[PDB]
Protein backbone atom coordinates (compact mmCIF):
# COMPACT_ATOMS: atom_id res chain seq x y z
CA UNK A 1 0.00 0.00 0.00
CA UNK A 2 2.39 2.66 1.21
CA UNK A 3 5.69 2.43 -0.61
CA UNK A 4 8.52 4.87 -1.06
CA UNK A 5 8.63 6.59 -4.42
CA UNK A 6 11.58 6.19 -6.75
CA UNK A 7 12.61 9.77 -6.00
CA UNK A 8 12.60 9.08 -2.26
CA UNK A 9 14.45 5.80 -2.74
CA UNK A 10 17.00 7.52 -4.96
CA UNK A 11 17.54 10.08 -2.21
CA UNK A 12 17.80 7.22 0.28
CA UNK A 13 20.45 5.56 -1.85
CA UNK A 14 22.26 8.88 -2.08
CA UNK A 15 22.04 9.18 1.71
CA UNK A 16 23.70 5.77 2.05
CA UNK A 17 26.35 7.09 -0.30
CA UNK A 18 26.72 10.11 2.00
CA UNK A 19 27.76 7.83 4.84
CA UNK A 20 29.47 5.33 2.57
CA UNK A 21 32.22 7.70 1.47
CA UNK A 22 34.34 4.91 -0.02
CA UNK A 23 31.37 3.54 -1.98
CA UNK A 24 32.28 -0.04 -1.04
CA UNK A 25 28.64 -0.73 -0.15
CA UNK A 26 29.69 -1.19 3.46
CA UNK A 27 29.55 1.40 6.21
CA UNK A 28 31.76 0.86 9.24
CA UNK A 29 32.67 2.79 12.37
CA UNK A 30 35.60 4.50 10.68
CA UNK A 31 33.42 5.67 7.81
CA UNK A 32 30.58 6.67 10.12
CA UNK A 33 33.00 8.48 12.42
CA UNK A 34 34.59 10.23 9.46
CA UNK A 35 31.17 11.37 8.28
CA UNK A 36 30.29 12.65 11.75
CA UNK A 37 33.68 14.36 12.03
CA UNK A 38 33.12 15.91 8.61
CA UNK A 39 29.83 17.25 9.94
CA UNK A 40 31.79 18.86 12.78
CA UNK A 41 30.46 16.36 15.29
CA UNK A 42 32.90 14.73 17.68
CA UNK A 43 31.51 11.45 18.91
CA UNK A 44 33.34 9.07 21.21
CA UNK A 45 34.44 5.63 20.07
CA UNK A 46 31.97 3.99 22.44
CA UNK A 47 29.16 6.13 21.07
CA UNK A 48 30.10 5.24 17.50
CA UNK A 49 30.04 1.55 18.35
CA UNK A 50 26.72 2.05 20.11
CA UNK A 51 25.29 3.80 17.04
CA UNK A 52 26.11 0.82 14.85
CA UNK A 53 25.12 -1.72 17.49
CA UNK A 54 21.77 -0.05 18.12
CA UNK A 55 20.80 -0.02 14.45
CA UNK A 56 22.51 -3.33 13.70
CA UNK A 57 19.29 -5.33 13.58
CA UNK A 58 20.91 -8.25 11.75
CA UNK A 59 23.85 -8.15 14.14
CA UNK A 60 26.23 -8.75 11.26
CA UNK A 61 28.51 -6.08 12.72
CA UNK A 62 27.67 -3.63 9.95
CA UNK A 63 24.91 -1.34 8.83
CA UNK A 64 23.66 -2.47 5.45
CA UNK A 65 21.50 -0.41 3.10
CA UNK A 66 18.26 -2.10 4.24
CA UNK A 67 19.23 -1.35 7.82
CA UNK A 68 19.88 2.27 6.83
CA UNK A 69 16.61 2.41 4.90
CA UNK A 70 14.62 1.58 8.03
CA UNK A 71 17.05 3.66 10.09
CA UNK A 72 16.39 6.87 8.17
CA UNK A 73 12.74 5.92 7.78
CA UNK A 74 12.38 6.34 11.53
CA UNK A 75 10.51 3.06 11.75
CA UNK A 76 9.55 1.82 15.18
CA UNK A 77 11.57 -1.10 16.46
CA UNK A 78 8.56 -2.25 18.44
CA UNK A 79 7.39 -5.29 16.51
CA UNK A 80 4.96 -6.03 19.33
CA UNK A 81 2.83 -3.31 17.76
CA UNK A 82 1.66 -6.00 15.35
CA UNK A 83 -0.04 -7.72 18.27
CA UNK A 84 -1.75 -4.45 19.16
CA UNK A 85 -2.98 -4.11 15.58
CA UNK A 86 -4.19 -7.72 15.69
CA UNK A 87 -6.02 -6.97 18.94
CA UNK A 88 -7.82 -4.09 17.22
CA UNK A 89 -9.02 -6.55 14.59
CA UNK A 90 -10.21 -8.89 17.32
CA UNK A 91 -12.16 -6.06 18.94
CA UNK A 92 -13.81 -5.04 15.67
CA UNK A 93 -14.24 -8.62 14.53
CA UNK A 94 -16.57 -9.49 17.39
CA UNK A 95 -17.98 -12.54 15.61
CA UNK A 96 -14.45 -13.76 14.84
CA UNK A 97 -15.42 -14.66 11.27
CA UNK A 98 -12.19 -13.06 10.06
CA UNK A 99 -14.15 -10.33 8.31
CA UNK A 100 -15.90 -7.13 9.24
CA UNK A 101 -19.45 -6.77 7.98
CA UNK A 102 -21.71 -3.73 7.96
CA UNK A 103 -23.55 -5.11 10.98
CA UNK A 104 -20.28 -5.45 12.87
CA UNK A 105 -19.34 -1.89 11.94
CA UNK A 106 -22.79 -0.70 12.99
CA UNK A 107 -22.26 -2.18 16.45
CA UNK A 108 -18.98 -0.27 16.78
CA UNK A 109 -20.68 2.96 15.71
CA UNK A 110 -23.65 2.21 17.98
CA UNK A 111 -21.29 1.82 20.93
CA UNK A 112 -20.18 5.40 20.27
CA UNK A 113 -23.53 6.51 21.66
CA UNK A 114 -24.96 7.86 18.44
CA UNK A 115 -27.80 6.79 16.19
CA UNK A 116 -27.10 6.48 12.50
CA UNK A 117 -29.08 5.01 9.63
CA UNK A 118 -28.26 1.71 7.97
CA UNK A 119 -27.80 3.60 4.71
CA UNK A 120 -25.03 5.67 6.29
CA UNK A 121 -23.32 2.47 7.44
CA UNK A 122 -23.75 0.96 4.00
CA UNK A 123 -22.32 4.07 2.37
CA UNK A 124 -19.35 4.06 4.74
CA UNK A 125 -18.80 0.36 4.12
CA UNK A 126 -19.26 0.94 0.41
CA UNK A 127 -16.65 3.72 0.35
CA UNK A 128 -14.21 1.59 2.32
CA UNK A 129 -15.15 -1.39 0.17
CA UNK A 130 -12.28 -1.07 -2.28
CA UNK A 131 -12.76 -4.58 -3.68
CA UNK A 132 -16.52 -4.06 -3.76
CA UNK A 133 -17.08 -7.55 -2.37
CA UNK A 134 -19.66 -6.23 0.10
CA UNK A 135 -17.26 -6.93 2.96
CA UNK A 136 -14.34 -5.21 4.61
CA UNK A 137 -11.17 -7.28 4.52
CA UNK A 138 -7.99 -6.83 6.54
CA UNK A 139 -6.35 -4.77 3.81
CA UNK A 140 -9.46 -2.63 3.49
CA UNK A 141 -9.65 -2.22 7.27
CA UNK A 142 -5.99 -1.19 7.36
CA UNK A 143 -6.77 1.51 4.79
CA UNK A 144 -9.63 2.71 6.99
CA UNK A 145 -7.38 2.81 10.07
CA UNK A 146 -4.54 4.48 8.18
CA UNK A 147 -6.99 7.06 6.89
CA UNK A 148 -6.13 10.56 8.00
CA UNK B 1 -6.52 -4.90 25.60
CA UNK B 2 -6.33 -1.69 23.62
CA UNK B 3 -5.47 1.43 25.55
CA UNK B 4 -8.06 4.17 25.82
CA UNK B 5 -5.79 6.50 23.88
CA UNK B 6 -5.50 3.93 21.09
CA UNK B 7 -9.26 3.46 21.09
CA UNK B 8 -9.73 7.23 20.99
CA UNK B 9 -7.47 7.45 17.94
CA UNK B 10 -9.52 4.74 16.24
CA UNK B 11 -12.72 6.56 17.13
CA UNK B 12 -11.34 9.88 15.89
CA UNK B 13 -10.40 8.31 12.56
CA UNK B 14 -13.85 6.80 12.18
CA UNK B 15 -15.48 9.99 13.46
CA UNK B 16 -13.54 12.04 10.92
CA UNK B 17 -14.66 9.92 7.97
CA UNK B 18 -18.15 9.63 9.45
CA UNK B 19 -18.53 13.41 9.43
CA UNK B 20 -17.36 13.56 5.82
CA UNK B 21 -19.69 10.68 4.93
CA UNK B 22 -22.52 12.39 6.80
CA UNK B 23 -21.91 15.61 4.89
CA UNK B 24 -22.04 13.74 1.59
CA UNK B 25 -25.07 11.79 2.78
CA UNK B 26 -26.90 14.98 3.76
CA UNK B 27 -26.09 16.35 0.30
CA UNK B 28 -28.38 13.72 -1.21
CA UNK B 29 -31.23 15.09 0.94
CA UNK B 30 -32.04 17.32 -2.03
CA UNK B 31 -32.97 14.22 -4.02
CA UNK B 32 -34.96 12.68 -1.16
CA UNK B 33 -37.93 14.80 -2.16
CA UNK B 34 -39.96 13.01 -4.80
CA UNK B 35 -43.12 14.99 -4.16
CA UNK B 36 -44.28 16.97 -7.15
CA UNK C 1 27.27 15.59 -6.46
CA UNK C 2 24.89 16.73 -3.76
CA UNK C 3 24.62 20.29 -2.54
CA UNK C 4 26.15 21.19 0.81
CA UNK C 5 22.60 21.76 2.07
CA UNK C 6 22.03 18.01 1.75
CA UNK C 7 25.23 17.42 3.71
CA UNK C 8 23.99 19.84 6.38
CA UNK C 9 20.79 17.78 6.60
CA UNK C 10 22.92 14.78 7.62
CA UNK C 11 23.88 16.68 10.76
CA UNK C 12 20.20 16.83 11.63
CA UNK C 13 19.73 13.20 10.58
CA UNK C 14 22.68 12.06 12.67
CA UNK C 15 21.80 14.38 15.52
CA UNK C 16 18.33 12.85 15.76
CA UNK C 17 19.77 9.33 15.82
CA UNK C 18 22.61 10.46 18.07
CA UNK C 19 20.19 11.90 20.62
CA UNK C 20 18.29 8.62 20.78
CA UNK C 21 21.48 6.72 21.61
CA UNK C 22 22.58 9.49 23.97
CA UNK C 23 19.31 9.15 25.88
CA UNK C 24 19.91 5.41 26.09
CA UNK C 25 23.38 6.15 27.48
CA UNK C 26 21.80 8.59 29.92
CA UNK C 27 19.52 5.80 31.15
CA UNK C 28 22.63 3.96 32.36
CA UNK C 29 23.42 6.94 34.56
CA UNK C 30 20.11 6.39 36.34
CA UNK C 31 21.15 2.82 37.14
CA UNK C 32 24.41 4.01 38.71
CA UNK C 33 23.05 7.13 40.39
CA UNK C 34 19.66 7.02 42.02
CA UNK C 35 18.19 8.95 44.90
CA UNK C 36 14.75 9.45 46.37
CA1 LIG D 1 31.98 1.88 2.92
CA1 LIG E 1 24.17 -5.19 10.22
CA1 LIG F 1 -16.47 -10.44 11.51
CA1 LIG G 1 -14.60 -5.52 0.52
Range of the domain at A21: 6-72
Alpha carbon separation from A99 to A95, A103, A110, A135, A141 (Å, rounded): 9, 11, 18, 7, 9
Compute the distance from residue A48 Cα to the ligand 2 centre, in Å.
14
- Give the Cα separation of A4 and C34 in Å (integer): 45
Residues of A in contact with B21 (CB under 8 A): 120, 123-124, 127
For residues B8-29, one letter each, b for 16 or more C-beta atoms within 10 angstroms of the residue's C-beta and e for the rest, the string is: eebbeebeebbeebeeebeeee
Using a CB-CB cut-off of 8 Å, the residues of chain C touching A36 are 14
Please name the helix (run of DSSP H) or strand (run of DSSP E) that holds residue A125, with its range, or none. helix A118-128
Sign of CA dihedral A49, A53, A58, A64: negative
CATH number for A46: 1.10.238.10
Give chain B positions within 8 Å (CB) of A91.
2
Q: What is the DSSP string of A59-108?
A: -SSSB-HHHHHHHTTT----TTHHHHHHHHHHHH-TT-SSSB-HHHHHHH
The Cα-based distances of A5 to A14, A40, A52, A80, A144 in angstroms read 14, 31, 27, 27, 22
Among all ligands shown, which has an atom nearest to the Cα of A132? Answer: 4
Asked if A145's CB is within 8 angstroms of B25's CB, the reply is: no
Question: Residue A129 burial by CB count (10 A; 0-12/13-18/19+): exposed, middle or buried?
Answer: middle
C14/A35 touch (CB, cutoff 8 Å), yes or no = yes
Minimum-distance CB partner of C13 among A38, A54, A72: A72
Q: Which residues surround ligand 2, an ion (CB under 5 A)?
A: A 56, 58, 60, 62
For residue A136, report the distance from its CA to the centre of ligand 4, in Å. 4
Amino acid sequence: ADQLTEEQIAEFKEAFSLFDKDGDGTITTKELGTVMRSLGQNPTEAELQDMINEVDADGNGTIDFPEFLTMMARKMKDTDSEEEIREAFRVFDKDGNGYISAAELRHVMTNLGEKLTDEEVDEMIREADIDGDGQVNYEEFVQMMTAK
Amino acid sequence: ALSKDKEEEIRKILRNNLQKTRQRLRSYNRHTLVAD
